[PDB]
Structure formats: C-alpha cells, structure tokens
C-alpha cells in the first residue's frame, strides 16, 4: 500500500523524506507521467508505473477502487535490505515487488535537483 512504499524507500535510503524527495520529480514520480523519463531516477518511477499497470492486468487481482496502492502486503526491513514476505498472496507479492524494485532502484539512481518540480508541460 502507498504508506508501505514510502516506508520501504525510507528503508533503502535512511536519510530521506520520500514525499519531499521523490514526489513531483521528473516526468513520472508524482501522478500519471508523460513523455520519456529525464534521467535514471525518473526511469525508476516510470518502471514503477508500468509495474502497477501490469498488476492491474492480472485477471485474478481486483484492487479496492482499482488502485494497487490500497493493497497492504507484508514486508520487513533490515540493515537496508527489503524482504517481501513469501506468504503474501500472488497479488500482494506483485505489488510488494514493484515497491521493492522501485525502492532499490531509487537508492542507486543519481539525484539531480534540476529535475525536482520539472516543468512537465514543456520537457515531458
């Protein structure tokens, strides 16, 4: 679920404010997305939107209000490493992995200030 994704980010990058840092960053990070991502970070964001798209398309997953962000799963954090619990259902595990791959991905992408609060209408 959304709050658990903010929290996995905080797991992978301990000195971060997720909403402050990665929301309205680039082409993608925020709501929807458009164009080509501006850098590796924005790309991480794009892959995550795609990862959620795929999930919405498993016939066997029907999310509350159609939003995978409402879906709680089980995971834990340990010395920087995120684990998705194996006992998540197939739907819960898919979301858990999207969030997981996006947190790690974030943690490795360079952070370019010029790209936070981008004029998307113009560059996206």
Sites of contact with Ca ion (CB under 5 A): 28, 33, 49, 72
14 or 76: CB nearest Ca ion: 76
Least distance from Ca ion to the Cβ atom of residue 6, Å: 14
Least distance from Ca ion to the Cβ atom of residue 52, Å: 9
User: What span, in angstroms and rounded, lies between the C-alpha atoms of 101 and 34?
Assistant: 21
Measured at the CA of 93, the angle between CA 1 and CA 57, to 5 degrees, comes to 85
47 or 72: CB nearest Ca ion: 72
User: What span, in angstroms and rounded, lies between the C-alpha atoms of 83 and 99?
Assistant: 11
Q: Residue 75 annotated as binding?
A: no
Task: Provide the β-strand partners of residue 25.
Answer: 29, 116
**Binding-site residues from annotation:** 28, 30, 32, 49
């Amino acid at each position: 679920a959304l709050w658990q994704f903010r929290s996995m980010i905080k797991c992978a990058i301990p000195g971060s404010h997720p909403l402050m840092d990665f929301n309205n960053y680039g082409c993608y990070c925020g709501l929807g997305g458009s164009g080509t991502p501006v850098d590796e970070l924005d790309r991480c964001c794009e892959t995550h939107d795609n990862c959620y798209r795929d999930a919405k398309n498993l016939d066997s997953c029907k999310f509350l209000v159609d939003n995978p962000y409402t879906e709680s799963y089980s995971y834990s954090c340990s010395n920087t490493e995120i684990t998705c619990n194996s006992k998540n259902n197939a739907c819960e595990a898919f979301i858990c992995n999207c969030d997981r791959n996006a947190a790690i991905c974030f943690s490795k992408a360079p952070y370019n200030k010029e790209h936070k609060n981008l004029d998307t209408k113009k560059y996206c």
